[PDB]
């Protein structure tokens, strides 16, 4: 259903402090929730396409690698 | 290998999404190595974005990240 | 199933990464190693299949140095 | 990289017979590939001021190389 709600506030803060954020305005959590949902939708869409093209029933790490590296998505910036 | 979101919810979410996009009727399984790969990548991804966002707060003399910072970060990244 | 033995692969990764390291030597995340090796092998198998295509085109079943080279040259990759 | 490993690799690739000259050639290829991907991975890591190479860096270097 809405398992994106299961991505926890302390988690996001924990991700933030790892990225050097001293403090967080309240609206960032939902925003961080949307970015991830959006992101794991491109990747999982692609991973699943590789698993089926290979006529397989398990998603493998090579599917995840290939999904991630696929064109038409920003990973870091202008480079890719 | 040190994850910041707990394995259990992240896996739930991964199933939900894969259930919607897969072409198969029976639920698609994931090797446990694959979901950990994905999670590490997803976390690294949000950290990259969180730190660009942070840089844009500092640029504006704030220490508090704001929605608009994260939105400007996404504009400049492409 | 990875066909290249993990230890000798990891060796070569660390040497190369030391050669390109600019600043405090770099460490690899074990999931990152595994991903590379996973991609490295898939690259070689793909390239081995193309190589075989050029051998059959020349009516040979023995793959040869010159088949691999023409395959690389046509691909343009690297 | 062992020659037996190249042999298994070749078979997955469907190859029936292998010239002895192919082995050195595959090493040259694997080394060249590892050079380009690792150069890009490392370059990004240092630019992010990070101290460890992540799967995201690899995936990014993979992306850009092929």
PDB file of C-alpha atoms in Angstrom:
ATOM      1  CA  UNK A   1       0.000   0.000   0.000  1.00  0.00           C
ATOM      2  CA  UNK A   2       1.948   3.019   1.333  1.00  0.00           C
ATOM      3  CA  UNK A   3       5.178   1.371   2.397  1.00  0.00           C
ATOM      4  CA  UNK A   4       6.916   4.646   1.538  1.00  0.00           C
ATOM      5  CA  UNK A   5       5.468   5.783   4.924  1.00  0.00           C
ATOM      6  CA  UNK A   6       7.654   3.025   6.442  1.00  0.00           C
ATOM      7  CA  UNK A   7      10.797   5.040   5.561  1.00  0.00           C
ATOM      8  CA  UNK A   8      11.369   6.492   8.948  1.00  0.00           C
ATOM      9  CA  UNK A   9      12.160  10.018  10.206  1.00  0.00           C
ATOM     10  CA  UNK A  10      15.234   8.954  12.234  1.00  0.00           C
ATOM     11  CA  UNK A  11      16.390   7.137   9.085  1.00  0.00           C
ATOM     12  CA  UNK A  12      16.172  10.305   6.984  1.00  0.00           C
ATOM     13  CA  UNK A  13      17.933  12.333   9.721  1.00  0.00           C
ATOM     14  CA  UNK A  14      20.551   9.576   9.803  1.00  0.00           C
ATOM     15  CA  UNK A  15      21.002   9.854   6.015  1.00  0.00           C
ATOM     16  CA  UNK A  16      21.181  13.658   6.398  1.00  0.00           C
ATOM     17  CA  UNK A  17      23.832  13.788   9.150  1.00  0.00           C
ATOM     18  CA  UNK A  18      25.872  11.382   6.961  1.00  0.00           C
ATOM     19  CA  UNK A  19      25.604  14.069   4.248  1.00  0.00           C
ATOM     20  CA  UNK A  20      26.688  16.718   6.776  1.00  0.00           C
ATOM     21  CA  UNK A  21      23.313  18.349   7.416  1.00  0.00           C
ATOM     22  CA  UNK A  22      23.317  20.095  10.824  1.00  0.00           C
ATOM     23  CA  UNK A  23      19.544  20.615  10.876  1.00  0.00           C
ATOM     24  CA  UNK A  24      16.408  19.877   8.843  1.00  0.00           C
ATOM     25  CA  UNK A  25      13.316  21.964   8.047  1.00  0.00           C
ATOM     26  CA  UNK A  26      10.167  19.897   8.602  1.00  0.00           C
ATOM     27  CA  UNK A  27       9.119  19.672   4.932  1.00  0.00           C
ATOM     28  CA  UNK A  28      12.228  17.717   3.904  1.00  0.00           C
ATOM     29  CA  UNK A  29      10.987  14.305   5.093  1.00  0.00           C
ATOM     30  CA  UNK A  30       8.056  14.011   2.663  1.00  0.00           C
ATOM     31  CA  UNK A  31      10.289  15.427  -0.061  1.00  0.00           C
ATOM     32  CA  UNK A  32      12.971  12.847   0.679  1.00  0.00           C
ATOM     33  CA  UNK A  33      10.174  10.241   0.599  1.00  0.00           C
ATOM     34  CA  UNK A  34       9.101  11.304  -2.919  1.00  0.00           C
ATOM     35  CA  UNK A  35      12.630  11.311  -4.362  1.00  0.00           C
ATOM     36  CA  UNK A  36      13.215   7.721  -3.202  1.00  0.00           C
ATOM     37  CA  UNK A  37       9.863   6.452  -4.400  1.00  0.00           C
ATOM     38  CA  UNK A  38      10.537   8.097  -7.749  1.00  0.00           C
ATOM     39  CA  UNK A  39      14.073   6.697  -7.797  1.00  0.00           C
ATOM     40  CA  UNK A  40      13.311   3.124  -6.844  1.00  0.00           C
ATOM     41  CA  UNK A  41      10.535   3.145  -9.411  1.00  0.00           C
ATOM     42  CA  UNK A  42      12.957   3.758 -12.377  1.00  0.00           C
ATOM     43  CA  UNK A  43      15.484   1.276 -11.133  1.00  0.00           C
ATOM     44  CA  UNK A  44      13.046  -1.486 -10.138  1.00  0.00           C
ATOM     45  CA  UNK A  45      11.185  -1.012 -13.431  1.00  0.00           C
ATOM     46  CA  UNK A  46      14.439  -1.613 -15.289  1.00  0.00           C
ATOM     47  CA  UNK A  47      15.696  -4.468 -13.078  1.00  0.00           C
ATOM     48  CA  UNK A  48      12.482  -6.345 -13.574  1.00  0.00           C
ATOM     49  CA  UNK A  49      12.728  -5.887 -17.372  1.00  0.00           C
ATOM     50  CA  UNK A  50      16.197  -7.500 -17.324  1.00  0.00           C
ATOM     51  CA  UNK A  51      14.947 -10.443 -15.214  1.00  0.00           C
ATOM     52  CA  UNK A  52      12.164 -11.124 -17.704  1.00  0.00           C
ATOM     53  CA  UNK A  53      14.290 -10.688 -20.834  1.00  0.00           C
ATOM     54  CA  UNK A  54      16.572 -13.335 -19.308  1.00  0.00           C
ATOM     55  CA  UNK A  55      13.424 -15.492 -18.818  1.00  0.00           C
ATOM     56  CA  UNK A  56      14.150 -15.590 -15.029  1.00  0.00           C
ATOM     57  CA  UNK A  57      12.122 -15.445 -11.778  1.00  0.00           C
ATOM     58  CA  UNK A  58      14.664 -14.085  -9.324  1.00  0.00           C
ATOM     59  CA  UNK A  59      16.000 -10.556  -9.451  1.00  0.00           C
ATOM     60  CA  UNK A  60      19.816 -10.907  -9.463  1.00  0.00           C
ATOM     61  CA  UNK A  61      22.529  -8.438  -8.556  1.00  0.00           C
ATOM     62  CA  UNK A  62      23.503  -8.163 -12.247  1.00  0.00           C
ATOM     63  CA  UNK A  63      19.931  -6.985 -12.911  1.00  0.00           C
ATOM     64  CA  UNK A  64      20.333  -4.305 -10.254  1.00  0.00           C
ATOM     65  CA  UNK A  65      23.720  -3.240 -11.574  1.00  0.00           C
ATOM     66  CA  UNK A  66      22.343  -2.970 -15.145  1.00  0.00           C
ATOM     67  CA  UNK A  67      19.209  -1.129 -13.996  1.00  0.00           C
ATOM     68  CA  UNK A  68      21.228   1.447 -12.072  1.00  0.00           C
ATOM     69  CA  UNK A  69      23.659   2.161 -14.904  1.00  0.00           C
ATOM     70  CA  UNK A  70      20.887   2.557 -17.504  1.00  0.00           C
ATOM     71  CA  UNK A  71      20.679   5.850 -19.428  1.00  0.00           C
ATOM     72  CA  UNK A  72      17.909   8.393 -18.857  1.00  0.00           C
ATOM     73  CA  UNK A  73      18.359   8.919 -15.118  1.00  0.00           C
ATOM     74  CA  UNK A  74      20.548  11.177 -12.925  1.00  0.00           C
ATOM     75  CA  UNK A  75      22.766   9.380 -10.387  1.00  0.00           C
ATOM     76  CA  UNK A  76      24.979  12.279  -9.235  1.00  0.00           C
ATOM     77  CA  UNK A  77      24.818  15.125 -11.785  1.00  0.00           C
ATOM     78  CA  UNK A  78      25.652  16.223 -15.354  1.00  0.00           C
ATOM     79  CA  UNK A  79      28.109  13.301 -15.705  1.00  0.00           C
ATOM     80  CA  UNK A  80      25.322  10.767 -15.042  1.00  0.00           C
TER      81      UNK A  80
ATOM     82  CA  UNK B   1      28.335  -2.850   4.404  1.00  0.00           C
ATOM     83  CA  UNK B   2      26.569  -0.431   6.814  1.00  0.00           C
ATOM     84  CA  UNK B   3      22.996   0.551   6.081  1.00  0.00           C
ATOM     85  CA  UNK B   4      21.131   3.436   7.680  1.00  0.00           C
ATOM     86  CA  UNK B   5      17.554   2.364   6.838  1.00  0.00           C
ATOM     87  CA  UNK B   6      16.565  -0.928   8.404  1.00  0.00           C
ATOM     88  CA  UNK B   7      16.447  -3.976   6.122  1.00  0.00           C
ATOM     89  CA  UNK B   8      12.848  -4.837   6.929  1.00  0.00           C
ATOM     90  CA  UNK B   9      10.880  -1.739   5.710  1.00  0.00           C
ATOM     91  CA  UNK B  10      13.177  -1.196   2.761  1.00  0.00           C
ATOM     92  CA  UNK B  11      12.401  -4.739   1.578  1.00  0.00           C
ATOM     93  CA  UNK B  12       8.640  -4.260   1.992  1.00  0.00           C
ATOM     94  CA  UNK B  13       8.816  -1.157  -0.234  1.00  0.00           C
ATOM     95  CA  UNK B  14      10.946  -2.989  -2.820  1.00  0.00           C
ATOM     96  CA  UNK B  15       8.309  -5.783  -3.128  1.00  0.00           C
ATOM     97  CA  UNK B  16       5.444  -3.294  -3.420  1.00  0.00           C
ATOM     98  CA  UNK B  17       7.096  -1.513  -6.348  1.00  0.00           C
ATOM     99  CA  UNK B  18       8.291  -4.724  -8.063  1.00  0.00           C
ATOM    100  CA  UNK B  19       4.797  -6.231  -7.688  1.00  0.00           C
ATOM    101  CA  UNK B  20       3.378  -3.339  -9.738  1.00  0.00           C
ATOM    102  CA  UNK B  21       5.968  -3.274 -12.582  1.00  0.00           C
ATOM    103  CA  UNK B  22       6.640  -6.984 -13.127  1.00  0.00           C
ATOM    104  CA  UNK B  23       5.017  -8.899 -15.955  1.00  0.00           C
ATOM    105  CA  UNK B  24       4.669 -12.060 -13.852  1.00  0.00           C
ATOM    106  CA  UNK B  25       1.679 -13.123 -11.704  1.00  0.00           C
ATOM    107  CA  UNK B  26       3.468 -15.000  -8.931  1.00  0.00           C
ATOM    108  CA  UNK B  27       5.497 -12.649  -6.748  1.00  0.00           C
ATOM    109  CA  UNK B  28       9.013 -12.118  -8.068  1.00  0.00           C
ATOM    110  CA  UNK B  29      11.818 -13.104  -5.679  1.00  0.00           C
ATOM    111  CA  UNK B  30      15.065 -11.158  -5.152  1.00  0.00           C
ATOM    112  CA  UNK B  31      18.453 -12.647  -4.272  1.00  0.00           C
ATOM    113  CA  UNK B  32      19.364 -11.215  -0.890  1.00  0.00           C
ATOM    114  CA  UNK B  33      22.551  -9.801  -2.429  1.00  0.00           C
ATOM    115  CA  UNK B  34      20.492  -7.893  -4.985  1.00  0.00           C
ATOM    116  CA  UNK B  35      18.310  -6.042  -2.431  1.00  0.00           C
ATOM    117  CA  UNK B  36      21.347  -5.087  -0.415  1.00  0.00           C
ATOM    118  CA  UNK B  37      23.102  -3.789  -3.538  1.00  0.00           C
ATOM    119  CA  UNK B  38      19.954  -1.799  -4.304  1.00  0.00           C
ATOM    120  CA  UNK B  39      19.688  -0.412  -0.795  1.00  0.00           C
ATOM    121  CA  UNK B  40      23.322   0.652  -0.545  1.00  0.00           C
ATOM    122  CA  UNK B  41      22.880   2.407  -3.931  1.00  0.00           C
ATOM    123  CA  UNK B  42      19.611   4.069  -2.931  1.00  0.00           C
ATOM    124  CA  UNK B  43      21.126   5.302   0.323  1.00  0.00           C
ATOM    125  CA  UNK B  44      24.292   6.540  -1.342  1.00  0.00           C
ATOM    126  CA  UNK B  45      21.959   8.310  -3.774  1.00  0.00           C
ATOM    127  CA  UNK B  46      19.973  10.162  -1.127  1.00  0.00           C
ATOM    128  CA  UNK B  47      23.204  11.074   0.703  1.00  0.00           C
ATOM    129  CA  UNK B  48      24.642  12.578  -2.505  1.00  0.00           C
ATOM    130  CA  UNK B  49      21.436  14.593  -2.861  1.00  0.00           C
ATOM    131  CA  UNK B  50      21.288  15.534   0.827  1.00  0.00           C
ATOM    132  CA  UNK B  51      24.838  16.914   0.676  1.00  0.00           C
ATOM    133  CA  UNK B  52      24.214  18.974  -2.482  1.00  0.00           C
ATOM    134  CA  UNK B  53      21.103  20.327  -0.713  1.00  0.00           C
ATOM    135  CA  UNK B  54      23.274  21.115   2.303  1.00  0.00           C
ATOM    136  CA  UNK B  55      25.752  23.008   0.100  1.00  0.00           C
ATOM    137  CA  UNK B  56      22.905  25.209  -1.141  1.00  0.00           C
ATOM    138  CA  UNK B  57      21.846  26.076   2.417  1.00  0.00           C
ATOM    139  CA  UNK B  58      25.390  27.151   3.343  1.00  0.00           C
ATOM    140  CA  UNK B  59      25.478  29.196   0.101  1.00  0.00           C
ATOM    141  CA  UNK B  60      22.490  31.107   1.518  1.00  0.00           C
ATOM    142  CA  UNK B  61      23.941  31.340   5.073  1.00  0.00           C
ATOM    143  CA  UNK B  62      21.550  28.822   6.599  1.00  0.00           C
ATOM    144  CA  UNK B  63      22.429  25.575   8.400  1.00  0.00           C
ATOM    145  CA  UNK B  64      18.894  24.296   8.020  1.00  0.00           C
ATOM    146  CA  UNK B  65      18.132  22.547   4.739  1.00  0.00           C
ATOM    147  CA  UNK B  66      14.863  23.627   3.129  1.00  0.00           C
ATOM    148  CA  UNK B  67      12.559  22.187   0.499  1.00  0.00           C
ATOM    149  CA  UNK B  68      13.666  24.941  -1.905  1.00  0.00           C
ATOM    150  CA  UNK B  69      17.304  23.937  -1.479  1.00  0.00           C
ATOM    151  CA  UNK B  70      16.561  20.344  -2.374  1.00  0.00           C
ATOM    152  CA  UNK B  71      14.564  21.603  -5.314  1.00  0.00           C
ATOM    153  CA  UNK B  72      17.369  23.843  -6.517  1.00  0.00           C
ATOM    154  CA  UNK B  73      19.786  20.883  -6.045  1.00  0.00           C
ATOM    155  CA  UNK B  74      17.663  18.775  -8.379  1.00  0.00           C
ATOM    156  CA  UNK B  75      17.641  21.581 -10.978  1.00  0.00           C
ATOM    157  CA  UNK B  76      21.432  21.968 -11.080  1.00  0.00           C
ATOM    158  CA  UNK B  77      22.113  18.195 -11.094  1.00  0.00           C
ATOM    159  CA  UNK B  78      20.100  17.975 -14.283  1.00  0.00           C
TER     160      UNK B  78
ATOM    161  CA  UNK C   1      27.993 -18.001 -10.261  1.00  0.00           C
ATOM    162  CA  UNK C   2      31.127 -15.891 -10.780  1.00  0.00           C
ATOM    163  CA  UNK C   3      33.685 -17.667 -12.947  1.00  0.00           C
ATOM    164  CA  UNK C   4      36.702 -15.532 -11.918  1.00  0.00           C
ATOM    165  CA  UNK C   5      38.196 -16.254  -8.508  1.00  0.00           C
ATOM    166  CA  UNK C   6      37.431 -13.445  -6.062  1.00  0.00           C
ATOM    167  CA  UNK C   7      40.862 -12.983  -4.482  1.00  0.00           C
ATOM    168  CA  UNK C   8      42.941 -12.499  -7.661  1.00  0.00           C
ATOM    169  CA  UNK C   9      40.218 -10.199  -9.016  1.00  0.00           C
ATOM    170  CA  UNK C  10      40.211  -8.097  -5.860  1.00  0.00           C
ATOM    171  CA  UNK C  11      44.055  -7.869  -6.070  1.00  0.00           C
ATOM    172  CA  UNK C  12      43.928  -6.306  -9.542  1.00  0.00           C
ATOM    173  CA  UNK C  13      41.208  -3.921  -8.442  1.00  0.00           C
ATOM    174  CA  UNK C  14      43.320  -2.561  -5.526  1.00  0.00           C
ATOM    175  CA  UNK C  15      46.498  -2.175  -7.622  1.00  0.00           C
ATOM    176  CA  UNK C  16      44.605  -0.218 -10.305  1.00  0.00           C
ATOM    177  CA  UNK C  17      42.756   1.872  -7.791  1.00  0.00           C
ATOM    178  CA  UNK C  18      46.087   2.796  -6.169  1.00  0.00           C
ATOM    179  CA  UNK C  19      47.433   3.828  -9.581  1.00  0.00           C
ATOM    180  CA  UNK C  20      44.543   6.285 -10.142  1.00  0.00           C
ATOM    181  CA  UNK C  21      44.234   7.467  -6.492  1.00  0.00           C
ATOM    182  CA  UNK C  22      45.245  11.129  -6.292  1.00  0.00           C
ATOM    183  CA  UNK C  23      45.063  12.091  -2.563  1.00  0.00           C
ATOM    184  CA  UNK C  24      45.079   8.425   2.174  1.00  0.00           C
ATOM    185  CA  UNK C  25      44.580   5.164   0.174  1.00  0.00           C
ATOM    186  CA  UNK C  26      41.085   4.202  -0.972  1.00  0.00           C
ATOM    187  CA  UNK C  27      38.984   1.310   0.278  1.00  0.00           C
ATOM    188  CA  UNK C  28      36.366  -0.608  -1.627  1.00  0.00           C
ATOM    189  CA  UNK C  29      32.936  -1.489  -0.295  1.00  0.00           C
ATOM    190  CA  UNK C  30      32.573  -5.242  -0.747  1.00  0.00           C
ATOM    191  CA  UNK C  31      29.271  -4.809  -2.562  1.00  0.00           C
ATOM    192  CA  UNK C  32      31.090  -2.426  -4.927  1.00  0.00           C
ATOM    193  CA  UNK C  33      33.832  -4.993  -5.677  1.00  0.00           C
ATOM    194  CA  UNK C  34      31.186  -7.626  -6.412  1.00  0.00           C
ATOM    195  CA  UNK C  35      29.262  -5.338  -8.745  1.00  0.00           C
ATOM    196  CA  UNK C  36      32.382  -4.578 -10.802  1.00  0.00           C
ATOM    197  CA  UNK C  37      33.357  -8.193 -11.084  1.00  0.00           C
ATOM    198  CA  UNK C  38      29.778  -8.986 -11.995  1.00  0.00           C
ATOM    199  CA  UNK C  39      29.931  -6.352 -14.776  1.00  0.00           C
ATOM    200  CA  UNK C  40      33.488  -7.344 -15.793  1.00  0.00           C
ATOM    201  CA  UNK C  41      32.472 -10.935 -16.441  1.00  0.00           C
ATOM    202  CA  UNK C  42      29.329  -9.971 -18.360  1.00  0.00           C
ATOM    203  CA  UNK C  43      31.455  -7.717 -20.511  1.00  0.00           C
ATOM    204  CA  UNK C  44      33.888 -10.532 -21.300  1.00  0.00           C
ATOM    205  CA  UNK C  45      31.171 -13.090 -22.080  1.00  0.00           C
ATOM    206  CA  UNK C  46      29.461 -10.569 -24.445  1.00  0.00           C
ATOM    207  CA  UNK C  47      32.767  -9.850 -26.114  1.00  0.00           C
ATOM    208  CA  UNK C  48      33.527 -13.576 -26.307  1.00  0.00           C
ATOM    209  CA  UNK C  49      30.161 -14.102 -28.084  1.00  0.00           C
ATOM    210  CA  UNK C  50      30.892 -11.403 -30.636  1.00  0.00           C
ATOM    211  CA  UNK C  51      34.367 -12.841 -31.187  1.00  0.00           C
ATOM    212  CA  UNK C  52      32.699 -16.187 -31.887  1.00  0.00           C
ATOM    213  CA  UNK C  53      30.360 -14.518 -34.403  1.00  0.00           C
ATOM    214  CA  UNK C  54      33.359 -13.243 -36.382  1.00  0.00           C
ATOM    215  CA  UNK C  55      34.995 -16.636 -36.271  1.00  0.00           C
ATOM    216  CA  UNK C  56      31.877 -18.293 -37.746  1.00  0.00           C
ATOM    217  CA  UNK C  57      31.707 -15.567 -40.399  1.00  0.00           C
ATOM    218  CA  UNK C  58      35.173 -16.636 -41.427  1.00  0.00           C
ATOM    219  CA  UNK C  59      33.998 -20.316 -41.295  1.00  0.00           C
ATOM    220  CA  UNK C  60      36.078 -21.178 -38.230  1.00  0.00           C
ATOM    221  CA  UNK C  61      35.127 -22.662 -34.889  1.00  0.00           C
ATOM    222  CA  UNK C  62      38.465 -21.616 -33.330  1.00  0.00           C
ATOM    223  CA  UNK C  63      38.350 -18.072 -31.956  1.00  0.00           C
ATOM    224  CA  UNK C  64      41.419 -16.057 -32.666  1.00  0.00           C
ATOM    225  CA  UNK C  65      43.290 -12.981 -31.605  1.00  0.00           C
ATOM    226  CA  UNK C  66      42.279 -11.262 -34.853  1.00  0.00           C
ATOM    227  CA  UNK C  67      38.560 -12.000 -34.260  1.00  0.00           C
ATOM    228  CA  UNK C  68      38.653 -10.383 -30.845  1.00  0.00           C
ATOM    229  CA  UNK C  69      40.452  -7.341 -32.258  1.00  0.00           C
ATOM    230  CA  UNK C  70      38.030  -6.776 -35.068  1.00  0.00           C
ATOM    231  CA  UNK C  71      35.212  -7.182 -32.601  1.00  0.00           C
ATOM    232  CA  UNK C  72      36.681  -4.505 -30.336  1.00  0.00           C
ATOM    233  CA  UNK C  73      37.369  -2.216 -33.269  1.00  0.00           C
ATOM    234  CA  UNK C  74      33.798  -2.432 -34.606  1.00  0.00           C
ATOM    235  CA  UNK C  75      32.274  -1.907 -31.150  1.00  0.00           C
ATOM    236  CA  UNK C  76      34.153   1.321 -30.472  1.00  0.00           C
ATOM    237  CA  UNK C  77      33.859   0.726 -26.698  1.00  0.00           C
ATOM    238  CA  UNK C  78      37.326   1.330 -25.164  1.00  0.00           C
TER     239      UNK C  78
ATOM    240  CA  UNK D   1      43.144 -14.199 -14.326  1.00  0.00           C
ATOM    241  CA  UNK D   2      43.616 -17.873 -14.764  1.00  0.00           C
ATOM    242  CA  UNK D   3      43.333 -19.459 -18.216  1.00  0.00           C
ATOM    243  CA  UNK D   4      40.776 -22.020 -16.880  1.00  0.00           C
ATOM    244  CA  UNK D   5      38.585 -19.043 -15.936  1.00  0.00           C
ATOM    245  CA  UNK D   6      38.853 -17.556 -19.447  1.00  0.00           C
ATOM    246  CA  UNK D   7      37.908 -21.035 -20.761  1.00  0.00           C
ATOM    247  CA  UNK D   8      34.731 -21.210 -18.647  1.00  0.00           C
ATOM    248  CA  UNK D   9      34.026 -17.654 -19.759  1.00  0.00           C
ATOM    249  CA  UNK D  10      34.420 -18.542 -23.416  1.00  0.00           C
ATOM    250  CA  UNK D  11      32.031 -21.507 -23.025  1.00  0.00           C
ATOM    251  CA  UNK D  12      29.290 -19.412 -21.476  1.00  0.00           C
ATOM    252  CA  UNK D  13      29.927 -17.330 -24.608  1.00  0.00           C
ATOM    253  CA  UNK D  14      29.367 -20.402 -26.803  1.00  0.00           C
ATOM    254  CA  UNK D  15      32.955 -20.768 -28.003  1.00  0.00           C
ATOM    255  CA  UNK D  16      34.033 -24.203 -29.201  1.00  0.00           C
ATOM    256  CA  UNK D  17      37.787 -23.907 -29.629  1.00  0.00           C
ATOM    257  CA  UNK D  18      40.346 -21.374 -28.433  1.00  0.00           C
ATOM    258  CA  UNK D  19      43.622 -20.259 -29.966  1.00  0.00           C
ATOM    259  CA  UNK D  20      46.435 -20.032 -27.411  1.00  0.00           C
ATOM    260  CA  UNK D  21      46.883 -16.379 -28.370  1.00  0.00           C
ATOM    261  CA  UNK D  22      43.421 -15.442 -27.041  1.00  0.00           C
ATOM    262  CA  UNK D  23      44.360 -15.660 -23.377  1.00  0.00           C
ATOM    263  CA  UNK D  24      46.868 -12.841 -23.328  1.00  0.00           C
ATOM    264  CA  UNK D  25      44.339 -10.879 -25.414  1.00  0.00           C
ATOM    265  CA  UNK D  26      41.541 -11.354 -22.815  1.00  0.00           C
ATOM    266  CA  UNK D  27      43.893 -10.125 -20.070  1.00  0.00           C
ATOM    267  CA  UNK D  28      44.632  -7.011 -22.093  1.00  0.00           C
ATOM    268  CA  UNK D  29      40.931  -6.473 -22.479  1.00  0.00           C
ATOM    269  CA  UNK D  30      40.022  -7.100 -18.843  1.00  0.00           C
ATOM    270  CA  UNK D  31      42.844  -4.769 -17.709  1.00  0.00           C
ATOM    271  CA  UNK D  32      41.797  -1.980 -20.139  1.00  0.00           C
ATOM    272  CA  UNK D  33      38.159  -2.276 -18.963  1.00  0.00           C
ATOM    273  CA  UNK D  34      39.204  -2.177 -15.296  1.00  0.00           C
ATOM    274  CA  UNK D  35      41.405   0.817 -16.017  1.00  0.00           C
ATOM    275  CA  UNK D  36      38.620   2.900 -17.574  1.00  0.00           C
ATOM    276  CA  UNK D  37      35.921   1.990 -15.055  1.00  0.00           C
ATOM    277  CA  UNK D  38      38.217   2.375 -12.058  1.00  0.00           C
ATOM    278  CA  UNK D  39      39.589   5.717 -13.213  1.00  0.00           C
ATOM    279  CA  UNK D  40      36.094   7.112 -13.336  1.00  0.00           C
ATOM    280  CA  UNK D  41      34.981   5.512 -10.031  1.00  0.00           C
ATOM    281  CA  UNK D  42      38.031   6.836  -8.179  1.00  0.00           C
ATOM    282  CA  UNK D  43      37.862  10.279  -9.754  1.00  0.00           C
ATOM    283  CA  UNK D  44      34.262  10.702  -8.564  1.00  0.00           C
ATOM    284  CA  UNK D  45      34.919   9.339  -5.047  1.00  0.00           C
ATOM    285  CA  UNK D  46      37.761  11.869  -4.479  1.00  0.00           C
ATOM    286  CA  UNK D  47      35.626  14.658  -5.830  1.00  0.00           C
ATOM    287  CA  UNK D  48      32.894  13.716  -3.319  1.00  0.00           C
ATOM    288  CA  UNK D  49      35.676  13.933  -0.713  1.00  0.00           C
ATOM    289  CA  UNK D  50      34.683  10.419   0.273  1.00  0.00           C
ATOM    290  CA  UNK D  51      37.239   7.870   1.341  1.00  0.00           C
ATOM    291  CA  UNK D  52      35.517   4.677   0.150  1.00  0.00           C
ATOM    292  CA  UNK D  53      34.393   3.528  -3.310  1.00  0.00           C
ATOM    293  CA  UNK D  54      30.666   2.690  -3.361  1.00  0.00           C
ATOM    294  CA  UNK D  55      28.496   0.663  -5.696  1.00  0.00           C
ATOM    295  CA  UNK D  56      26.970   3.950  -6.868  1.00  0.00           C
ATOM    296  CA  UNK D  57      30.463   5.110  -8.016  1.00  0.00           C
ATOM    297  CA  UNK D  58      30.969   1.880  -9.887  1.00  0.00           C
ATOM    298  CA  UNK D  59      27.533   2.123 -11.481  1.00  0.00           C
ATOM    299  CA  UNK D  60      28.263   5.683 -12.411  1.00  0.00           C
ATOM    300  CA  UNK D  61      31.633   4.713 -13.983  1.00  0.00           C
ATOM    301  CA  UNK D  62      29.944   1.783 -15.788  1.00  0.00           C
ATOM    302  CA  UNK D  63      27.310   4.164 -17.111  1.00  0.00           C
ATOM    303  CA  UNK D  64      29.832   6.574 -18.522  1.00  0.00           C
ATOM    304  CA  UNK D  65      32.160   3.974 -20.018  1.00  0.00           C
ATOM    305  CA  UNK D  66      29.648   1.989 -22.095  1.00  0.00           C
TER     306      UNK D  66
END
